[PDB]
Chain length 389, copies 3
């Protein structure tokens, strides 16, 4: 709420909520790390939707606390002091909080303080699934994780493996680039195309009407909200790039057909199937860290019926898929996102851009996101609720 | 237009336009590089008056395009793709533009797009003269280059050689320092003074009336607009610096008389004649890159009637004039400009400064610039014209 | 005056002046360096309360001038030119000022200028005491230095030795941390505690009423204004830190009793006695450099009746006290101050903090500072008085 000039928001009637969501959507689940990255009793710090958070594993279970002492507002993480398995003590004046509910249960510097038991640090639900750590950055009872994940991510036999890193661009530029039908042009020279014998057009010549370009999903049984890119159902793929009629570039004529099923879902996760191989799928999140950065959380899934298959997949992922696809293919997406930063930095790119046909997919997403998000994160949420107002 | 607090502009009645021109004057020709720095088919990027530009040489002729794709606003230069001699293709979605007129002539990702032939990237006139590349950062048909150059710069026999670099100061601080009669004090220890046996006073004791201190030229046949520094016509040069009557510093008593003809011209180019030698002239521009930086475009001219003379001059320029004068003399001007940055950074130096007599020259320039500039560059010009307003 | 959002100042009714004093209090004496750091004829530059200053020693006496030429606002210090013992000449156009009164007495570039003798650079009183250089950053005749120093700092036999450095935090965060009764918890592992066999509790269990927690001194004969921390008179020290009743940390049970007398005084100097040893005292200033930094001026005092005692103290200070206490003990105070920067950066920490009992000392200081400061430094003071208004 109110993150962008009200004059700008008025000019984007329809996508106002999305354009105002510079810090991301509150009240959604977001992956922030892999389960294997956090061990028992070893607290980790991270920033999500602009909020500094602390995560710890106690008796195998994950807990999340706001990394900001209620007293003088310092980050508890400057010098972590976990003196009992169930608590964390601020290094400054020893205000001690329970990981389970955030309650201020003791103050070592004054065990008679009237504040004891009468204050509580903000906590957020945390859930592990498919080896991924999800945090519900929101208030009140959380919805099922399934609502904020793409279809078949949570399938029992679906084996998930991935990589995560911090990228310097607003999360929305990442989402749009990912769901951009014509951006495929930047991947024309990817080592994955050659090395994995992929069929890859340079673009698409749209066919049919506007509504036919996508499929807005707002009737999913588990509550998922997203959009499918159907530009290929009535459109013809472009394999010959011409300038003045002269062919100056050709697409890839490989045998492997992939990415014929592309969808984007709130809070901002893309599903590409099948990819990077006809028997795999890719699920990637663009998680808001702050207005200028996001976690590029990549995962590749492949059905596995037994430990043997999971073991081999893990080996192929490490030796091939990770370096050839997640990096060899998606690395170009990273600098593409970065290249849009300047134009959208002053919030004016949203009104000065000149879109064309294939962008219908992006427009569909901006509308769905505007209408189905569960809340707009604001600086007020970040700085906290005032006292004495 | 509107680059400075309106309260400030009101307090500088008269020089308001000049004080507001933080980004420079639009609709003027500006040198940005030397001809030898750009070869056939090798695009170059640069920022002029805050605008990112692309320049290319095609069939020997120079062309200039706005380095910002109309689609998503990325710089085409992130990954240059010139697929035909007459065009450039954006690396993102392949929108293709003609260098000649900026028209969007093709889109490789969708050759059926309705945008083709219906959009046009901004272009700017470019002209080469005396081995220097000039760009007309303005709209509509450009005036003769002569209007924006000092007298005798374009003389047929005038051989021009120079150096260019980026300096961290607003362009106006550079102009004023260059046209500052008393700033000569900072050059008192220049190696050029000794090594070239120059006569150089520490300052001047003004004589005559105010109007006699300068000569405002606004009746030049080719349209040039500038001011001559005539402080030496009625004033007496100061060769003995005294404090409490005691001589603490003396000027230079060399035989070579130079810089007795000094003039500043819009858009911001200084002419010093003769200098650094009695048979040479210096023409230097202070080109606006953005509000905090400028190109310090230095050139030294010397009449040459034949290839033999031009060849020797080139040799002397490289072995002597460039290192002894352009660098040995003008290097002090660079940190002097930088030293004024802080005081003028908040736009208040324009009203808090305390000028004295010799500054009449600077005041004359601020008035001429305010009255004869061809337009004030604004952030609106930089960010571009909005859509849907 | 007006350094903070008026909405914020209204919410802190009472401490408004203190909260608005981001740049420090004008019209107070502040130490900025040690006498031994500035020699005869060797000018030094520094920034105090946001103002760039120049200090010089002439015939053994210190003088302070504003490091900003009246002409074009450059710092004279870019290239110091002291051509006569009593003056300094700006490197740009040679406007020459007297160190004694700041008067513009000559201009080498124009000895006939009408400005000569009619302009004056700002000067500030400077006084040396106990080997420390104090500057009265204020206007008009200065009060006795004693008014702005803690009791017994100026005692004849009191031998003062110290260290100074620049710290990245607003000065107020430094003052509050220093006068914070419960912050002692951060010093629990200091090498000084063990190596000097100190008795050091983890905190305090307050006793008595609110007014009994401190002693506000506003009736001192020399005008000093400060507050004593009396939390230990009715309170019981905490040596056993418990969580859920379980002892998880203990204080230090050393024999040496110290810091039983703690007081903070305007403009911002703390006195701890006895410390770091039962026969010594510590006086430390948190001097405003700009809104984000301060000088952490530490001094340790010890009575000495003869040169022999002073000589031995100096030796002990260098080999023990300086590295074990000033650094070994106070280094933790440095990062503690830095840890509060973020929460108070937007000026909202003053209203969002949640204090508890021992903070009564800090509240008492914020009230005293608000009521007895001699002026609020503003950006207006820094940028200077306008011309032509
Ligand atoms: S800031 Fe955490 S206990 Fe004081
Ligand atoms: S941003 Fe250039 S073609 Fe899309
Ligand atoms: S700026 Fe100092 S004499 Fe001109
Ligand atoms: Fe991509
Ligand atoms: Fe110069
Ligand atoms: Fe401390």
């Amino acid at each position: 709420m109110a993150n962008v000039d009200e004059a700008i928001l008025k000019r984007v009637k329809g996508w106002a909520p999305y354009v105002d969501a510079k810090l991301g959507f509150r009240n959604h689940w977001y992956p922030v790390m892999f389960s294997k990255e956090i061990n028992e009793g070893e607290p980790k710090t991270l920033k999500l939707l602009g909020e500094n958070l602390l995560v710890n594993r106690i008796d195998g279970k994950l807990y999340c606390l706001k990394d900001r002492c209620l007293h003088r507002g310092v980050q508890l993480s400057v010098k972590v002091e976990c003196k009992t398995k169930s608590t964390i003590t601020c290094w400054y004046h020893a205000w001690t909080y329970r990981w389970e509910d955030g309650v201020l249960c003791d103050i070592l510097t004054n065990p008679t303080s009237a504040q004891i038991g009468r204050q509580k640090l903000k906590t957020y639900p945390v859930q592990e699934a498919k080896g991924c750590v999800f945090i519900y950055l929101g208030d009140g009872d959380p919805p099922p994780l399934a609502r904020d994940t793409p279809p078949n991510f949570l399938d029992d036999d679906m084996e998930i493996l991935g990589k995560n890193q911090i990228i310097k661009s607003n999360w929305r530029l990442a989402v749009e680039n990912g769901f951009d039908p014509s951006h495929i042009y930047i991947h024309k020279d990817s080592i994955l195309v050659k090395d994995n014998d992929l069929a890859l057009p340079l673009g698409f010549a749209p066919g049919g009407d506007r509504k036919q370009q996508t499929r807005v999903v707002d009737d999913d049984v588990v509550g998922r909200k997203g959009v499918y890119d159907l530009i290929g159902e009535h459109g013809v793929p472009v394999f010959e790039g011409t300038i003045g009629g002269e062919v100056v570039r050709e697409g890839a004529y490989g045998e492997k057909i992939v990415a014929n099923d592309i969808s984007i879902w709130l809070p901002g996760v893309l599903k590409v199937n099948p990819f990077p191989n006809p028997d795999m799928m890719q699920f990637e999140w663009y998680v808001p860290i702050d207005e200028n950065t996001h976690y590029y959380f990549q995962t590749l899934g492949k059905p596995c019926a037994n430990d043997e298959e999971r073991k081999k997949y893990e080996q192929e992922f490490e030796s091939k898929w990770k370096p050839m696809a997640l990096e060899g293919f998606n690395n170009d997406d990273i600098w593409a996102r970065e290249a849009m930063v300047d134009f959208y930095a002053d919030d004016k790119g949203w009104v000065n851009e000149i879109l064309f046909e294939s962008d219908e997919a992006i427009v569909a997403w901006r509308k769905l996101a505007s209408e189905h998000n569960q809340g707009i994160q604001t600086q007020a949420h970040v700085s906290g609720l005032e006292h004495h107002h």
